Amino acid sequence: AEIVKILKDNLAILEKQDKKTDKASEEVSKSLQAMKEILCPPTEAVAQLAQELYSSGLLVTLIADLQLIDFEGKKDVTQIFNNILRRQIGTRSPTVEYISAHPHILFMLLKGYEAPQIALRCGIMLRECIRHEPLAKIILFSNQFRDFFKYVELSTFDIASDAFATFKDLLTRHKVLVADFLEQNYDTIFEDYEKLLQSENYVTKRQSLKLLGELILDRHNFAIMTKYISKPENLKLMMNLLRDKSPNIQFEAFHVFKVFVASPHKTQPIVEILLKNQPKLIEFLSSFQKERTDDEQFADEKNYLIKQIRDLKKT
Amino acid sequence: PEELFTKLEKIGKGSFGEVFKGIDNRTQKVVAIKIIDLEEAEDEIEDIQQEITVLSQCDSPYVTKYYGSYLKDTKLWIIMEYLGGGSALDLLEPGPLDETQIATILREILKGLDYLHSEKKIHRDIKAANVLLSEHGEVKLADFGVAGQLTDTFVGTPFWMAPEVIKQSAYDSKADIWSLGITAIELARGEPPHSELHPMKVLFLIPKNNPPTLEGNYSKPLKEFVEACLNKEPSFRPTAKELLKHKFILRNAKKTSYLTELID
């Protein structure tokens, strides 16, 4: 409670672009270093420290003015945030309830990927928030979720890789929440995802194709799976990706492609494409990646699809 | 992508790609270029990206510095600290090491472990092959482990692995202390314990059989250092800070500039 009063006033001084803030940075970092020693063990004074951070609204201004804090101080901000977030009084989680009432915290962390100086630090904290279903729900259903499709395509590899890390977590952690979300925003969310499968970046094209395959095969995403494999232009894309210059990309495509073929309730436009390329796909899959010898599953999977295509007939 | 750096000599042909001695065309500083072909290295991208995350969080002169990554088509360029003094494993190749050299190397590993463990990080792959030297004599830790025993494997080198890691029980910083004890025997005898056996047989032996002991013409403080580290119970093993104050380290370890004598 003593340290809170000093840090609150000094951060407001640092908020000003004045050169006099150079001395305040020493006081801000020392305040954060003292708070880290309390939380990270003694837990008597910890109980009062939490309520002081909530009521002051300091937990909001610390992320807001994270770029103005020094490296050593920035490390402490992360340690404090991640510790406070895991605090549990009974069944209730007080920080999750706080960030539920203060959602700007989540969007400030997400907008963090735009600034390289704090992008990775923000990524870690944003990922810690989305561990809890209510905080993941807020980002998922927000319009700011669509920014990930631009954040994963960034020029800096490390930030872009961290962006996909959070993006993947948001779509795979809370499977009941994700399934309902994807069902609601299907048309807009998959219009954006198509751009990732069309990416010039090999890693973006591979990891997106892999995640798509992972999403569709999950039991919770049955409605999404049925909707994806019903669209004719989606099969055409998977069939085109099987012909990509990269054998890793064409292998990742095969796992999305196999879902289209193995389904008993295939839509007529899909049946027409598969019948129009019936002997073409028979000879393709017969010679497709024969080098993969130590993979009995892939060998059996190919023969199943060859039979499924050969067994195809008109309605 | 290739315009910012110039590859000089090929300092090593890696598992997935190739490592080169390089120079930054911007800052003129000498760096190590790790070019990885993401093809043939099917999956493993997530593992490289996880190592990049850990390395970017590390800021210590006892852990290899990371400068950044660049992607060109299917090849990933990793820019790291240049250390042309080889590894501790390479120092064992021309002949046997004396107890002064063993204590000097172990002290530097402990200084590196002290930073990682205080930063709530586990190296997970402490061995002479991962203990690198600068050129001036500086000793830094490189090539961290992963997470999940099924993901480890049969592929795997369990000679340095802690018994609780194989037992698939909860492991912390103390697992690296076991690995340090095996590395101490590796620096003294030349090779780690049960080296004459197949890795699969060693994997089952470690949690079953008694902890290894250093045998032969080796002093009592060195034997006691190994005994302290190689404890089947991780909670009974001393911390990195505790082993820095060991009777063997304080008496036999000298200046790191003396390690310059071994450069082959």
Author numbering:
A (entry chain A): 15 to 54, 61 to 335
B (entry chain D): 20 to 172, 179 to 289
Verbatim from the authors:
The MO25 scaffolding protein operates as critical regulator of a number of STE20 family protein kinases (e.g. MST and SPAK isoforms) as well as pseudokinases (e.g. STRAD isoforms that play a critical role in activating the LKB1 tumour suppressor). Mammals possess two closely related isoforms termed MO25α and MO25β, which share 79% sequence identity. Recent work has demonstrated that MO25 isoforms also interact with at least five distinct protein kinases that are related to STRADα/STRADβ and belong to the STE20 branch of mammalian kinases. The catalytic activity of SPAK and OSR1 is stimulated over 100-fold by binding to MO25 isoforms, whereas MST3, MST4 and YSK1 are activated three- to four-fold.
We crystallised a complex of an MST3 catalytic fragment (residues 19–289) with full length MO25β. The 19–289 fragment encompasses the kinase domain, but lacks the C-terminal non-catalytic domain that contains a WIF motif (residues 325–327 in MST3). Two copies of the MST3:MO25β complex occupied the crystallographic asymmetric unit and in each case the same binding arrangement for MST3 and MO25β was observed. The structure reveals an intricate web of interactions between MST3 and MO25β that function to stabilise the kinase domain in a closed, active, conformation even in the absence of ATP or an ATP-mimetic inhibitor. MO25β binds to MST3 adjacent to the helix αC which has a key role regulating kinase activity in most kinases. Structural comparison with the STRADα:MO25α complex revealed additional interactions involving MST3 strands β4 and β5. The extensive number of interactions between MST3 and MO25β can be divided into three sections: (a) Hydrogen bonding interactions involving the central part of αC and strand β4. (b) Central hydrophobic interactions involving the N-terminal part of αC and residues from strands β3, β4 and β5. (c) A network of hydrogen bonding interactions involving the loop between MST3 strand β3 and αC.
